[PDB]
C-alpha cells in the first residue's frame, strides 16, 4: 500500500 | 479451582457449590453497577432483578440461572439455607436472563442480622426440559437441584454481599 | 444487453461502489422478465443496490437534520434557512429513490410473486421504502407513509406466518423491520420489543432442527433481533 | 450567497459526505481570491473536497481496470468489451474533475499565491492532478500530463527547499507526492527512494526542535515517507 | 445502533 | 535477567554483555528469514546486511546498533574478540538500520574452525552524538564502547550461529 499525502 | 479462588475465599464453593471450572461468561448488573465477587450492594440498589448476560457462542445452547441466599435469615444462624431468590431457565447462549423462562420470580433481597451473600449460579442444560418450580423458597439445595435436572456442574458463578441499610 | 450481462454490469458496479448504476442495471433486469420472477441472486442484487443508494442519503439526512435543530436551539436564523434548503434537496432525492423502487414493486415485483418467500420478500421491501419515506416526511404525508408501511408489513407478516418457518431469514428480517417500524416511526417501544421477542422466541424454538448452513443463515438475523432487544431494554 | 455561507455549507456538505456539493461551495469561495487569498481553513476545505471527489473515482477506476485484466487473461471478449466501456465512463469523470480544479489553479489559486507555503501548496496540488490524469491517460495526453506533473512538482520544489523548514508538512507532502510520481508514473524506484530518503533525513535532523503541535503535524507525513521507503526497499 | 435487515 | 534467558544460555550475556531488561523491539531479517537466538544461518544467507527494524515510540529518539563476532578467529581461540562486523548510529525510533548512519560498514561473516555467534546489540542514545569508528575491526569491546559513548545498557539483543559451508 503505497501512500500519498493526506491533503 | 485454586485454594484462593474468590468463590472459595467466599465459601460459596463450600456452602453452596463444589469446585468447578468456569467455561461461560456471566455478567450481573444492577443499573450501571456490575457485580464482582464479594462486592457490597445496598438492598435498595437490588430490589429489582439485575440484567444478567450469559456467554457462549451458540443460541441452541440453553442455560439455567439460580440465585440463592446461603445465609438466610442470618449468616450467624442460616437455618433456611439456601433461600431461592430467582430462577430462570432456557436462556439461549449469547443472550440474557431476560430472554429465558422465569420459573421463580425475583425476590428482592432484604438481609438482616449480618452480611448476606447473594449467589448467582449458571448451569448449561443438556437440552430442552421442563423445570418445575420448588413449592417453597427456604431450604433450597442447588446441588440437589442440578442433579435432579442434569445440569451437571456450574459453568459460572458470582456473588455480592449485602446488609440492612444502616 | 443480455440479462446475464446486466447482472454482470450490476456486479461490476457493486464492486466499483457505484450504486446508482447498480440500481440502473438491476432495474433493466427487473423489467425485462415479466411476471416471471427474478432468481434469488438477482432479487438480492436489486435489494442491495437500492439499499446502498437510499442508505447514503439516509445518513446524509440524519446528519443535516441533527445540525438543523441544534442551530434552531441557538436561534441562528440565517444558518437554519440554508440548512433547510439543503435538507430539502436531500429529501427530494430520498423521494425519488423511494418512488423508483416502490413503482417497480407495484408493477412488477410484488404482483409477479407466486411463492411465499417472494411475496414476503417484496411486501417487506415495500414496507421498507414507505418506512424510509416516513422517516423524513411530516404531518399528513408522514401518517400516510406509516399507513402504507403497516399494510405492507402486515400482509408480509400474515404470509410469512402461514408459510415460512419461524427460522427463515426472510421471515426473521420481516420481524426485524416491523419492530423497527414500531420503534422509530410509531414510537411504541413495548410493541417493538414484543414483536421482536415473539419472532426471536419462535425461531429459538426451532433453531436446533436446522442443518449447519441454514442455522448460520438464521442466526445472522437473530443476532440483530437480539441486539435491538438488548438496546431497547437497557439501563 | 456570501463567502462565509459558502464556507459554512461546504462544512455541512462535508459532514454529509456529499463531496460534489462541497466542491461546488468551495469553488465559489475560491473564485474570490484576487488580491485576497484563501485562509488556511478555506484552502484545506477546497483540497479535502476535490480529494474525496477524485478519490472515489480513482478507487472505482482501479478495481474495474484490474477486473478488466482478470477477464483479459481469461479470454472473455464480451466481458472486456463491456468493462472497458464502463472504465471509459469513469475516465470521463476523472478528466472532468481534474479539469475543474486545474483550471481553478491556473486562473485563481496559483497566481494569487503570496506566502511561500501557499505557492508550494497550490503548485503541488497542480502536480497531483496532472499525475491523476497520468494514472489513466495514454499516448499523447499521458505525455503532457507527465511533463506538466514534473514542471509543477519541480517549481514547487524550488520554492520549498529555499523557503520552508524541512519539517514543514507541506514541504514534506510535496516530497512524498513527488516521489510517488517517480515510482508509479515514471517507473524509477531509485529516484523515488532518494528524493523521499533525503526529505526524510533533512526533517529528521530538525524534528526535535518542534513544539508538540508542529511535531504531530510533521511526523504524520514522515510516517508516510517512512512506510513507502520500507515498502520500496522490502524483500 | 438501532438496526435493520441486510435485505 | 533469568539464568534461562537465551542470551545467558548463549553466553552472549557473559562473553559480551551484562544482563539488561529488553525494552525496545528489535527484528533482524536476512531475506525472509527472521533471526531468533541461536538460529543457524549459512554464511551465504548472510553475505549482505540484514534488515533491522528498530522499535521505540518516536523518531526523535536515536539508537545505535552493534554487530560483533565474539568467536573470531574461532570459538576455541577467540583472540580477536570481539570482531566488529557492522555498526550503525542515529537510527530513528520506529525506523530501521537502513535509516541510520553507517559507522563501520557491513562485512560478511566468513566463519572457520567451528561455529561463530554473530551478535546484534541495540542501544538507545541520549541524543544525536558524534560516534567514531574504531580504527580496526578486531578486539572491539562493546561494553567499553557503550561507556565511551554514553549508551547505557542494551535495550535489546539477538544472535545467530554460523559455520563454514562445506
Amino acid at each position: 500500500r503505497v501512500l500519498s499525502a493526506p491533503f | 479451582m485454586r485454594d484462593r479462588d474468590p468463590l472459595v475465599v467466599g465459601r460459596v464453593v463450600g456452602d453452596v457449590l463444589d469446585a468447578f471450572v468456569r467455561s461461560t461468561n456471566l455478567k450481573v448488573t444492577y443499573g450501571s453497577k456490575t457485580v464482582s465477587n464479594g462486592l457490597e450492594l445496598k438492598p435498595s440498589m437490588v430490589t429489582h432483578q439485575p440484567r444478567v448476560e450469559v456467554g457462549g457462542n451458540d443460541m441452541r445452547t440453553f442455560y439455567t440461572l439460580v440465585m440463592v441466599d446461603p445465609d438466610a435469615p442470618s449468616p450467624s444462624d442460616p437455618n433456611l439455607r439456601e433461600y431461592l431468590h430467582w430462577l430462570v431457565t432456557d436462556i439461549p447462549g449469547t443472550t440474557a436472563a431476560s430472554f429465558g423462562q422465569e420459573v421463580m420470580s425475583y425476590e428482592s433481597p432484604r438481609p438482616t442480622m449480618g452480611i448476606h451473600r447473594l449467589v448467582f449460579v449458571l448451569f448449561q442444560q443438556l437440552g430442552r426440559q421442563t423445570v418445575y418450580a420448588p413449592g417453597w423458597r427456604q431450604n433450597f439445595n442447588t446441588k440437589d437441584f442440578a442433579e435432579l435436572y442434569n445440569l451437571g456442574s456450574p459453568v459460572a458463578a458470582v456473588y455480592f454481599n449485602s446488609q440492612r441499610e444502616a | 444487453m443480455s440479462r446475464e450481462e446486466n447482472v454482470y454490469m450490476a456486479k461490476l458496479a457493486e464492486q466499483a461502489e457505484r450504486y446508482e448504476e447498480m440500481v440502473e442495471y438491476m432495474e433493466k433486469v427487473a423489467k425485462t422478465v415479466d411476471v416471471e420472477e427474478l432468481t434469488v441472486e438477482e432479487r438480492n442484487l436489486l435489494s442491495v443496490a437500492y439499499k446502498n443508494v437510499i442508505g447514503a442519503r439516509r445518513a446524509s439526512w440524519r446528519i443535516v437534520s441533527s445540525i438543523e435543530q441544534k442551530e434552531e436551539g441557538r436561534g441562528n436564523e440565517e444558518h437554519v434557512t440554508l440548512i433547510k434548503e439543503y435538507r430539502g434537496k436531500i429529501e427530494a432525492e430520498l423521494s425519488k429513490i423511494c418512488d423508483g423502487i416502490l413503482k417497480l414493486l407495484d408493477s412488477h415485483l410484488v404482483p409477479s410473486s407466486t411463492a411465499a418467500e417472494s411475496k414476503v420478500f417484496y411486501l417487506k421491501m415495500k414496507g421498507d421504502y414507505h418506512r424510509y419515506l416516513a422517516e423524513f416526511k411530516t404531518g399528513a404525508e408522514r401518517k400516510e407513509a406509516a399507513e402504507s408501511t403497516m399494510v405492507a408489513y402486515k400482509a408480509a407478516q400474515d404470509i410469512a406466518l402461514a408459510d415460512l418457518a419461524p427460522t427463515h431469514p426472510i421471515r426473521l428480517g420481516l420481524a426485524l423491520n416491523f419492530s423497527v417500524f414500531y420503534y422509530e416511526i410509531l414510537n411504541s417501544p413495548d410493541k417493538a420489543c414484543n414483536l421482536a421477542k415473539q419472532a426471536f422466541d419462535e425461531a429459538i424454538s426451532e433453531l436446533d432442527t436446522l442443518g449447519e448452513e441454514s442455522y448460520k443463515d438464521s442466526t445472522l438475523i437473530m443476532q440483530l433481533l437480539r441486539d435491538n432487544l438488548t438496546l431497547w431494554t437497557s439501563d
Side-chain angles (χ1 to χ4, degrees), chain A, chain B, chain C:
Chain A
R1 23 124 273 188
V2 27
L3 302 322
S4 42
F7 58 86
Chain B
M1 263 172 180
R2 288 224 158 279
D3 266 326
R4 258 114 258 191
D5 191 293
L7 291 180
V8 7
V9 172
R11 330 259 84 171
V12 179
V13 177
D15 308 333
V16 183
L17 308 181
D18 296 319
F20 67 93
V21 177
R22 296 162 176 89
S23 56
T24 314
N25 286 171
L26 176 82
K27 188 174 177 194
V28 182
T29 304
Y30 291 93
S32 68
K33 295 327 161 161
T34 293
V35 172
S36 192
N37 272 150
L39 242 35
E40 164 147 22
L41 261 22
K42 297 140 167 154
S44 65
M45 289 150 81
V46 312
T47 59
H48 294 82
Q49 69 181 257
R51 287 180 187 81
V52 179
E53 310 175 1
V54 336
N57 286 293
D58 198 336
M59 285 181 255
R60 298 112 117 202
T61 325
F62 278 14
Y63 302 81
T64 285
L65 179 66
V66 178
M67 177 193 180
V68 287
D69 193 345
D71 304 297
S74 172
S76 290
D77 181 47
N79 62 94
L80 303 174
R81 175 180 290 176
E82 328 146 6
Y83 196 77
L84 189 53
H85 276 275
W86 195 22
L87 182 63
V88 176
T89 59
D90 292 338
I91 306 171
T94 255
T95 258
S98 73
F99 284 78
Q101 244 93 316
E102 173 191 286
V103 166
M104 307 279 308
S105 59
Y106 178 93
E107 202 192 296
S108 37
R110 323 259 214 204
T112 64
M113 295 177 282
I115 300 168
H116 288 229
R117 302 164 290 171
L118 288 308
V119 184
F120 301 77
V121 195
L122 193 71
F123 293 99
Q124 168 174 313
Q125 286 145 239
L126 278 182
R128 283 196 282 269
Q129 37 174 159
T130 291
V131 176
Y132 304 96
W136 49 86
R137 297 176 184 252
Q138 333 88 282
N139 305 306
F140 189 76
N141 186 284
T142 298
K143 267 201 224 93
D144 290 345
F145 172 94
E147 152 110 86
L148 188 47
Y149 296 112
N150 297 304
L151 297 179
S153 291
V155 302
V158 77
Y159 80 97
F160 74 87
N161 290 130
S162 197
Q163 61 182 316
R164 201 171 43 78
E165 329 224 335
Chain C
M1 275 173 77
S2 157
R3 264 31 81 127
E4 358 276 342
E5 287 185 323
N6 289 304
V7 169
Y8 186 71
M9 288 309 283
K11 272 179 210 164
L12 220 212
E14 164 171 58
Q15 277 199 75
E17 314 203 324
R18 298 195 128 235
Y19 295 109
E20 30 284 293
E21 287 171 351
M22 203 198 170
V23 162
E24 273 161 12
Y25 287 113
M26 275 325 293
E27 207 103 290
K28 296 141 115 48
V29 178
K31 275 168 261 180
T32 211
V33 324
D34 250 51
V35 153
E36 93 109 314
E37 310 193 90
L38 314 179
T39 128
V40 161
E41 226 231 342
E42 306 159 337
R43 159 256 262 169
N44 292 0
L45 252 21
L46 174 78
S47 177
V48 172
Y50 262 109
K51 190 67 74 29
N52 277 95
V53 180
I54 201 66
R57 281 85 182 163
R58 287 207 287 153
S60 305
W61 181 99
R62 291 187 283 253
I63 266 142
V64 173
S65 204
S66 180
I67 298 291
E68 199 179 316
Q69 33 214 170
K70 114 170 293 128
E71 230 73 352
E72 268 170 355
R74 290 176 188 153
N76 314 11
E77 248 35 75
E78 231 184 290
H79 285 170
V80 168
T81 130
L82 261 6
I83 302 162
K84 246 145 170 122
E85 175 181 50
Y86 193 63
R87 179 163 58 91
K89 201 175 167 177
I90 296 171
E91 295 179 4
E93 281 183 22
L94 290 155
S95 290
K96 258 46 95 208
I97 301 148
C98 285
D99 177 73
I101 174 59
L102 252 14
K103 261 159 164 79
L104 187 67
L105 287 154
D106 289 349
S107 76
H108 276 80
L109 273 8
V110 172
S112 85
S113 286
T114 57
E117 280 175 24
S118 313
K119 217 79 212 183
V120 182
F121 192 100
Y122 291 123
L123 291 163
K124 165 196 159 308
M125 206 175 160
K126 193 173 142 123
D128 293 333
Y129 282 87
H130 284 296
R131 175 162 56 92
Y132 304 149
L133 286 181
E135 271 169 1
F136 79 86
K137 303 297 204 185
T138 203
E141 259 207 276
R142 185 188 135 81
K143 119 135 168 56
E144 172 184 277
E147 306 263 42
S148 297
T149 306
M150 187 63 91
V151 165
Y153 282 164
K154 229 211 227 77
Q157 189 181 58
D158 289 336
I159 292 159
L161 175 66
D163 277 8
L164 296 185
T167 57
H168 202 292
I170 281 165
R171 187 183 152 159
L172 250 20
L174 178 278
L176 186 57
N177 291 4
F178 211 173
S179 86
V180 172
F181 166 66
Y182 271 98
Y183 194 90
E184 321 213 288
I185 297 320
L186 263 21
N187 300 119
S188 319
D190 278 0
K191 278 154 187 134
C193 283
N194 290 173
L195 197 172
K197 173 60 147 44
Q198 237 225 263
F200 182 90
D201 289 4
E202 287 156 1
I204 276 300
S205 93
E206 283 183 24
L207 245 205
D208 63 343
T209 66
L210 295 190
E212 173 61 27
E213 287 293 311
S214 174
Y215 153 81
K216 300 221 319 270
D217 283 330
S218 303
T219 55
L220 203 322
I221 300 166
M222 276 162 103
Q223 293 173 153
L224 309 169
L225 248 8
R226 177 205 64 210
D227 289 4
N228 281 353
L229 278 171
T230 293
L231 203 214
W232 295 333
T233 229
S234 74
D235 168 78

